[PDB]
Structures are given as structure tokens and as C-alpha cells.
A paper describes a structure:
A number of enzymes, termed fructosyl amino acid oxidase (FAOX), have reactivity for fructosyl amino acids as major substrates. Some of these enzymes, which also exhibit reactivity for fructosyl dipeptides as F-VH are specifically termed fructosyl peptide oxidase (FPOX). AnFPOX-15, which featured 11 amino acid replacements in AnFPOX-1 exhibited significant F-VH oxidation activity, whereas reactivity for longer fructosyl peptides such as fructosyl tripeptide (F-3P, Fru-VHL), fructosyl tetrapeptide (F-4P, Fru-VHLT) and F-6P was never observed.
To confirm the structural influence of the [name] mutation, the crystal structure of AnFPOX-15 [name] was determined. Ligand-free AnFPOX-15 [name] and AnFPOX-15 [name]/FSA structures were crystallised under similar condition as those used for AnFPOX-15, and the structures were determined via molecular replacement using coordinates of AnFPOX-15 as the initial model. No other significant structural differences were found between AnFPOX-15 and AnFPOX-15 [name] (rmsd = 0.148 Å for 431 Cα atoms). As well as in the case of AnFPOX-15, no significant structural difference was observed between the ligand-free AnFPOX-15 [name] and AnFPOX-15 [name]/FSA (rmsd = 0.17 Å for 431 Cα atoms). From these observations, the generated [name] mutant acquired significant oxidation activity for F-6P, and the wider space of substrate gate in [name] mutant was confirmed via its crystal structure.
Author numbering: 4 to 433
Write the structure that this text describes.
């Protein structure tokens, strides 16, 4: 480990920073690790560059249970990550027939895991029970609502946690490249047959050589190399509203509130800011782009970066749905002004499992992407398994789920309600 050189492409991001962290913990020599990201860690265009994220339980795919438990343990006990986890719990709510059904079935799925999750997860069938966990609601507001309360979760101070990894990496003497000298252009090969990767070249022409390369470029991964449409990148949206300390006080330590027909909000941070998201299948930004491995040009959804273009917001349609979420959850704040309107990018696989594997042809080159919009929670632990993969030690439960799988389904729809619409058809964000 001490004599192996690793390049982590996108190391200023969620899966990338986690990987560089666990390389250091595993005893890799800091000077042998090179983080290449367009932006310095925490990357300003990273999906994890956010006031907060939700930490919650999900049992959709096979490794999800173990990954979640693994992450929880670390969010609660790892001194590096512990300050950034706010265990206020989460309550999912609904008042529709289909919505309440989904809540009940979800609850039952937790039980069917058979590990005792009913001890920290509760079905709330009455108004009183809902108001008890979320005193800021009014009784009239929640008429007909049912709730599912998960006591294990809460929210995460996202950018702060990635910055915490970054501080450590830099203290340790990890090598960095940012800007054009940090922006992956193509991999380097020993022979023209392309079967042995020996490094990467960035868009400025700078070459970096290493034993192994990890591609953790999030929503950009599919643009940089050909993933054969395994990964379709999509934008989700959020707005902010600012509360006074007096307005914020009713929401202190209140659970994350979610409703699948509206979206979610998180309690005001130390500055009185509430972030609100809607729920929708996402937006693509289609372009032709020549990834490598294609390397002919190919239509791929390419992120329109808010970091490189701060004057971008979100479509008009998103303004509507975000305001509906605010009316649903926070009607007393309907006249609050929305601001820091922005788009946040992820990349979906067909089955919403990760794409974490060695490239089929380019040995030495490893993919660590396919976050599918639900992987910030895995910040503390995902790097441990990326390292296991590098070392040939990744267990089958993860390896099989994360394997190279082109043609395994339509990633444009993925596991969501619909194929994503494209930003070219949604006016207002420019
Ligand atoms: C968008 C979004 C996502 C999200 C969320 C809400 C929104 C609005 N809420 C979540 C939640 O409540 N709970 C949760 O678990 N996840 C939530 N998410 C998803 C989460 O943000 C993403 O799953 C995760 O952050 C993605 O990580 P990933 O590592 O995959 O992506 P990234 O963090 O963006 O990192 C990518 C890095 O790559 C760098 N980059 C890009 N191009 C290059 C090149 N060419 N060379 C080098 N680096 C490159 C980017 O800069 C970035 O740093």
C-alpha cells in the first residue's frame, strides 16, 4: 500500500473524498495519492457542496441495509464525521390513498428485514402522534395525514463534512491538481491496445502516472468516459428561505419532513436558513460530448455547472413545485422570498445501484460513480469499499450489485416515476 500510487479523479467530491480518506486510513503514503478535481476540495460544483443532506434508511437494493448501518455507525461515532450528523429523525408523511399505502408498505419492508427496525421506526396513525414529533404543524394543516417516523436518521452538514475530509488530506500531504490541471481529459495507457491504464492526462496537457486510477466524477463521469449509457446525469433543484431566530425557534431540532407528492425541507441551520426540495424525476441537459472509450462523440446528459455559471437558477416549473412544498409544509412562510436558487447534479443507473468496478478493458482504471441521487449518506464508508475493490477484496454483496452492466435498463427513467425532461424544454433557468 505504501508503494502504490493512486489518482482519484473527482477527489474533491463525495465518493472521491471518501476514497482518498480511506486510502490514507489503510496506510497508503499521502504523497502517492493525487486528487484531481476541477475545483479544490470541497468542490464547489460537487453535489455534496450543500448546506445539508438527509440521512435516512432505505432497503431498495441488496447492499443498502448494510451500507446504511455502516454509514450510521460512523456518522454517530467517527470523530471526523460525528460533528456533522444531526440525529433529529425524519418523518415521511402523506394524505393520499396511494401515498399512505406506500408509507405502510415501506414500514413493513423495514420490519421484514427482521433485524429489529420496528424499535426505532414507527407508523403514526393519528394527528396527535404527528404533532408530537413535529410541533410546528397545526392540527388543521395535518388533517388526514399519516406518518412514518424514522428515529435513526436526521440531516448532515454536507459541505462541512467534505471540507473536514479535505482539511485532513491536505494536512497529510495528499497531492492535488485543480482547474485545467485538475480536469480529467483522458486515461493514459502503456500500449495502444488500451488494456493497461498507467495514469491520466488533464485538459491542459499535464500527465499524471500511477498504478491505479479511480473515476469518481459524479454526474460528469458519463461525460468523461463511455459508460455505454449506464449512467444518465440529471439535475435536481432547491431554494432557500431565511427565518428570523424567533421564526426559526419553533423548528429547532425538528425532524426532517418528507412527502413524496411534494418534496422535503430541513430545519433552519445556525443562520436561520431552511432548504427546500421538491420531488420530481430530474432534468437532463443533453449535449453531444466525446467521452473517452467511446471516443467518438455521443449524446450524454452533461451538467450545466452552477459553480462555473452562478447566474443560473432553475426552470420556472421548479419554482412552482418548490412553492407548493412550502405551502404544504410551511404555509406561514408563503410570503418568504426564495433565494440561492440552484440546480444540483447526480447520475442515475437503471436499478439505482452504484457503478463501482474496474473498467472491463482498462485494467488499473476503476469506476466509482452511479450515485443515483442517494449516496451522500455514504460519505463516511463508501471509500472503504472502493479501496477493497482496488485491492481485490470487495465482497460479493457489493461487487455484484455494482458491476459493469451496459444494457441493463433505461437510466433515463431509472427507478423514478418518469423519464427526465430536458432543460432545453424547460424555460427560465438562464
Ligand atoms: C442534487 C441533490 C443530491 C442529493 C440531495 C439533494 C440534491 C438536490 N439530497 C440528498 C439527500 O438528502 N441524501 C442523500 O443521501 N443524497 C442526496 N443527494 C445526492 C448526493 O448529493 C449525491 O449522491 C452525491 O453527493 C454524489 O457524489 P459524487 O461523488 O458521486 O458526485 P460529486 O460529489 O458531485 O463528485 C463529483 C466530483 O467530480 C468532479 N469532477 C467533475 N469533472 C471532473 C473532471 N473532469 N476531472 C476531475 N474532477 C471532476 C466534480 O468537481 C466533483 O467534485
Amino acid at each position: 500500500r505504501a508503494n502504490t500510487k493512486i489518482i482519484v479523479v473527482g477527489g474533491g467530491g463525495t465518493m472521491g473524498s471518501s476514497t482518498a480518506l480511506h486510502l490514507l486510513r489503510a496506510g497508503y503514503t499521502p504523497s502517492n495519492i493525487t486528487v484531481l478535481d476541477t475545483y479544490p476540495i470541497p468542490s464547489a460544483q460537487s453535489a455534496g457542496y450543500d448546506l445539508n443532506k438527509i440521512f435516512g434508511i432505505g432497503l431498495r437494493n441488496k447492499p443498502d441495509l448494510q451500507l446504511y448501518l455502516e454509514a450510521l455507525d460512523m456518522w454517530k461515532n467517527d470523530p471526523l464525521f460525528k460533528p456533522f450528523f444531526h440525529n433529529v429523525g425524519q418523518m415521511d408523511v402523506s394524505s393520499t390513498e396511494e401515498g399512505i399505502k406506500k408509507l405502510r408498505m415501506r414500514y413493513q419492508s423495514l420490519l421484514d428485514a427482521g433485524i429489529g427496525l420496528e424499535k426505532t421506526n414507527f407508523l403514526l396513525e393519528s394527528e396527535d402522534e404527528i404533532l408530537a414529533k413535529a410541533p410546528h404543524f397545526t392540527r388543521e394543516q395535518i388533517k388526514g395525514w399519516k406518518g412514518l417516523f424514522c428515529g435513526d436518521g436526521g440531516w448532515l452538514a454536507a459541505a462541512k463534512a467534505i471540507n473536514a475530509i479535505g482539511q485532513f488530506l491536505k494536512e497529510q500531504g495528499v497531492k492535488f491538481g485543480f482547474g485545467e490541471a485538475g480536469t480529467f481529459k483522458k486515461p493514459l495507457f502503456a500500449d495502444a491496445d488500451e488494456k493497461t491504464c498507467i495514469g491520466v492526462e488533464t485538459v491542459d496537457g499535464t500527465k499524471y502516472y500511477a498504478d491505479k486510477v479511480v473515476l469518481a466524477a459524479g454526474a460528469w463521469s458519463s461525460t468523461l468516459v463511455d459508460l455505454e449509457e449506464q449512467c444518465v446525469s440529471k439535475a435536481w433543484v432547491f431554494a432557500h428561505i431565511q427565518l428570523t431566530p424567533a421564526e426559526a425557534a419553533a423548528y429547532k431540532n425538528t425532524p426532517v419532513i418528507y412527502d413524496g407528492d411534494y418534496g422535503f425541507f430541513i430545519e433552519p441551520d445556525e443562520n436561520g436558513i431552511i432548504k427546500v426540495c421538491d420531488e420530481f424525476p430530474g432534468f437532463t441537459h443533453f449535449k453531444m460530448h466525446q467521452p473517452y472509450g467511446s471516443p467518438v462523440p455521443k449524446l450524454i446528459s452533461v451538467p450545466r455547472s452552477h459553480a462555473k455559471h452562478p447566474t443560473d437558477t432553475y426552470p420556472h416549473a421548479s419554482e412552482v413545485t418548490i412553492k407548493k412544498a412550502i405551502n404544504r409544509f410551511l404555509p406561514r412562510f408563503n410570503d418568504k422570498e426564495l433565494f440561492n436558487r440552484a440546480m444540483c447534479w447526480c447520475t442515475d443507473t437503471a436499478d439505482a445501484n452504484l457503478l463501482v468496478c474496474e473498467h472491463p478493458r482498462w485494467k488499473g482504471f476503476y469506476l466509482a460513480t452511479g450515485d443515483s441521487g442517494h449516496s451522500f449518506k455514504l460519505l463516511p464508508n463508501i471509500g472503504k469499499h472502493v479501496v477493497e475493490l482496488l485491492e481485490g477484496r470487495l465482497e460479493s454483496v457489493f461487487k455484484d450489485a455494482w458491476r459493469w452492466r451496459p444494457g441493463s435498463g433505461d437510466a433515463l427513467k431509472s427507478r423514478r416515476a418518469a423519464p427526465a425532461k430536458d432543460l432545453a424544454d424547460m424555460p427560465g433557468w438562464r
